[PDB]
Design a protein around this ligand. Structure first.
Ligand SMILES: Cc1cc2nc3c(=O)[nH]c(=O)nc-3n(C[C@H](O)[C@H](O)[C@H](O)COP(=O)(O)OP(=O)(O)OC[C@H]3O[C@@H](n4cnc5c(N)ncnc54)[C@H](O)[C@@H]3O)c2cc1C
Ligand SMILES: Cc1cc2nc3c(=O)[nH]c(=O)nc-3n(C[C@H](O)[C@H](O)[C@H](O)COP(=O)(O)OP(=O)(O)OC[C@H]3O[C@@H](n4cnc5c(N)ncnc54)[C@H](O)[C@@H]3O)c2cc1C
Lengths: 458, 458
């Protein structure tokens, strides 16, 4: 057996750990799929490249309301797929080389890793290795309902849909999460009619109810939305696919995209042989120092975190990287803890949505004395420039102190507009201070935040 | 003579002064032109409404770089003018109503006001009034070169160009400031040929040298740029206008736009009769209490401020309004001081520009030990989604402390992207904390700021 000071399962956020301070130690990296993890190859980055092209198309079909006449002649889907992965694939693959060929003290294994012992890992390549410390960066994988993975019909996930040969005439999406609603926006804007099937009574059910409700009402005018009904059976009739719901409705289309959720891959690693505890949802249990229940074993990313988000896994990687070099199970004094406090999320759909902190419901359930202002985009000068009638910025702050508790933006550049709120929240800045203690450029999209704060009572 | 507790010259930011705390006080408002001041009617608001339509036109003409085929059929200038001012004039006039219709104890004068005495004001309507306190909100007026306003040729300024009946085939602009380059962006994107004549060797001379330099290179590939030689004569040959420069070049076109700068309106008020001091360029002299040299008189806005910016003038009104109600010339303890420190500016041209703090030159001339990072838009995942090759985020931070001293962004949504820097600066937030002490949404335009901070040397 080959011994290492460090073994890393997962080339996602796991690849960000080895830097200069580790040069004197030999590292083993295990990657069963594409190099670079879900984020680079089939997730955050390539998705938003399609979203951008879809937003350009939306600009064109709506240009009349601004007094500019234009026609959307067509979309070259193949050339879009060509352009996106024409940049993604050389990058994923350039890093794979770096780790296996420059490899100053690194060894890459291309197999499914599995714990056979304490720090004993079957590589899936026919080898077994040992490590002084191990980091689990196994991420998550799409959840496929049994009704789909038994019918025998062709279905898609984020792992292949972005590489379709042609644009589907009718896309049927199973799911109401951010993956489903982002793909609905991408495809519908480019020319596909999208049908979305949701189990819940709203799309993006788990967001603030005012955001979830209004987006659903806007979505109903853009896509064929079917809520409240779980699917019951799937039937493939040639190239056409039919999906039967519990209420009896049958949704037929060209391509079936499954986006019902993601499952952390901890259950695939044989963690029981390593003494790594799994909780009730399949995430590996770690502490504020990302140290698991097992010695010398850390975890990060979708395999452990409650927020299956890249910027979270990257933050935790900074913590693991530092805690890796000290006396982890001996000295907590030199250890850094992970800050899981003001985690933002974004949905790149139309309208685009971003959040951070608590929903208004969550604020009241905690029994908080709050003030709330929902500011309309079309009420600031920049919102008029856009002739906006959908955008809102809802800020929930606390009465008396002005301590902001949450912010929810639905509208253009939502993931960027919220950043001043993320910033003020993360550093304890009061809302009355954020409004008046700085200048806001007039007139820019930013002014919606300022007026949201100015409309807040105390 | 009619006596008042307060007289206000200027319906721009001056109209924002009377609130609830003045209900028991009689107020006189003097406005010689259109109600609402420059920003609402011929300035801040209507320009950015045109700029957005120009961004729609640009999106369509460049959309193929994303794999979307579209044609710019035409531009409906008349329909642009109606849509912009179709909401602007009912608002200006709705506000004119409110002050004469709600008017609890307020009187509006539509005439050119001039100080004839201490606090004695000729209304320009044939009356003379006095007030216990006076606020000057007279703003500024366009500067017209003598060669232009003597030639007898028809010329336009920002006060009428947005009300042209038709789109000019070839627009000739005299100026290199933010007004010239915003209008250069507006017309060229909509179909006009644009010639820009600047006396300087760069457009936007007053920006960070790297920002001004790259923007000029980009402008030169979009417009007919004439640098380094001042104009000498203007001669009209029918409807066509020809402008001769000092080097001998003659730039001819159909429409002449003058955008060389603005002059504060202090010189027109007969101010010496009031003992209100004017400095060396014509702004009314005030202190941190917006107090002029004469008792009972304040000033604000473009008529006094060094920053002829709306968000500044609105802030100064907040100070004047509060200090108006106390004994400013007796007890400074209860008074509001104006914060003129982290004033941002933005130019809504192609590419969009925003700045705050110190330029690299200003930082070095001030003898600070600085570090600089110029981050390109196309280096974060969102820059790939746009296929950006022009955007930059330049951050100037101090070595050792990481305290930011300046930030300069050229690219999409520059006035919104920069706001986290304005905020972090305004509350003394360091780069080391701002970068890592908060979460940034992946992948959004915001990440360009994050990596700019990550690239700073200490
Ligand atoms: C469609 C989609 C869109 C997304 N959009 C966003 C977004 O906008 N913003 C955001 O912040 N996040 C987004 N995410 C989430 C982000 O892509 C991931 O959550 C992120 O990569 C988490 O990092 P990770 O390394 O833990 O996961 P991963 O990147 O999946 O890393 C896990 C790695 O381990 C490997 N592995 C698994 N099992 C084995 C084994 N047995 N042996 C060897 N190797 C193995 C996998 O091949 C993979 O390379 C998105 C995800 C998806 C699917
Ligand atoms: C084209 C353009 C674009 C701009 N864009 C921006 C931008 O994006 N952001 C920004 O922050 N700033 C911008 N500005 C600057 C902005 O217009 C000013 O900073 C702001 O309007 C200052 O407000 P004010 O009330 O002091 O000036 P004004 O709005 O001009 O108010 C002065 C008013 O007083 C009246 N008046 C003058 N003299 C007399 C008199 N003797 N008697 C009676 N009434 C009188 C005038 O008619 C006018 O209505 C722009 C300016 C222009 C010209």
């Amino acid at each position: 057996m080959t011994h290492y000071d460090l073994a890393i399962i997962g080339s996602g956020s796991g690849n960000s750990l080895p830097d200069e301070r580790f040069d004197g130690k030999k590292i083993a990296i295990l990657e069963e799929g594409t190099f670079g993890g879900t984020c680079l190859n089939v997730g955050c980055i390539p998705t938003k490249m399609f979203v951008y092209a879809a937003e350009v198309a939306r600009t064109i079909t709506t240009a009349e309301k601004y007094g500019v006449d234009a026609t959307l002649d067509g979309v070259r889907w193949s050339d879009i797929v060509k352009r996106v992965f024409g940049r993604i694939d050389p990058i994923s693959a350039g890093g794979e080389r770096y780790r296996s060929e420059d490899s100053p003290n690194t060894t890459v294994y291309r197999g499914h890793a599995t714990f056979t012992g304490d720090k004993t890992i079957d590589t899936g390549t026919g080898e077994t290795i040992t490590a002084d410390q191990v980091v689990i960066a196994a991420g998550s994988r799409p959840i496929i309902p049994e009704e789909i993975a038994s019918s025998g019909v062709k279905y898609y996930t984020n792992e292949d849909i972005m590489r379709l040969p042609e644009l589907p005439e009718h896309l049927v999406i199973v799911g109401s999460g951010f993956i489903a609603t982002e793909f609905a926006h991408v495809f519908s804007a480019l020319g596909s009619r999208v049908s979305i099937i949701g189990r819940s009574q709203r799309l993006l059910r788990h967001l603030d109810d005012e955001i979830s409700e209004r987006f659903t009402e806007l979505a109903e005018q853009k896509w064929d939305v079917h809520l409240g009904s779980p699917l019951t059976s799937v039937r493939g009739d040639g190239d056409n696919i039919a999906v039967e719901l519990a209420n009896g409705t049958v949704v037929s289309g060209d391509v079936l995209l499954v986006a019902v959720g993601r499952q952390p891959n901890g259950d695939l690693l044989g963690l029981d042989k390593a003494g790594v505890e799994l909780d009730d949802k399949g995430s590996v249990v770690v502490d504020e120092y990302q140290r698991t229940t097992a010695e010398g074993v850390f975890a990060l990313g979708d395999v452990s975190s409650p927020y299956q988000l890249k910027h979270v896994a990257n933050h935790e990687a900074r913590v693991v990287q530092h805690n890796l070099l000290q006396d982890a199970w001996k000295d907590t004094s030199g250890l850094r803890s992970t800050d899981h406090r003001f985690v933002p999320a974004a949905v790149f759909t139309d309208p685009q949505i971003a959040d951070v902190g608590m929903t208004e419901k969550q604020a009241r359930d905690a029994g908080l004395d709050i003030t709330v202002k929902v500011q309309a985009y079309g009420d600031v000068a920049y919102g008029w420039a856009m002739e906006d009638q959908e955008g809102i910025c809802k800020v929930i702050a606390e009465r008396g102190t002005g301590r902001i508790l949450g912010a929810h933006v639905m509208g253009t550049q939502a993931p960027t507009v919220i950043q001043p709120l993320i910033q003020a929240m993360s550093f304890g800045l009061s809302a009355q201070d954020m409004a008046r203690g700085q200048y806001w450029i007039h007139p820019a999209l930013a002014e919606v935040v300022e007026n949201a704060l100015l409309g807040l009572d105390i």
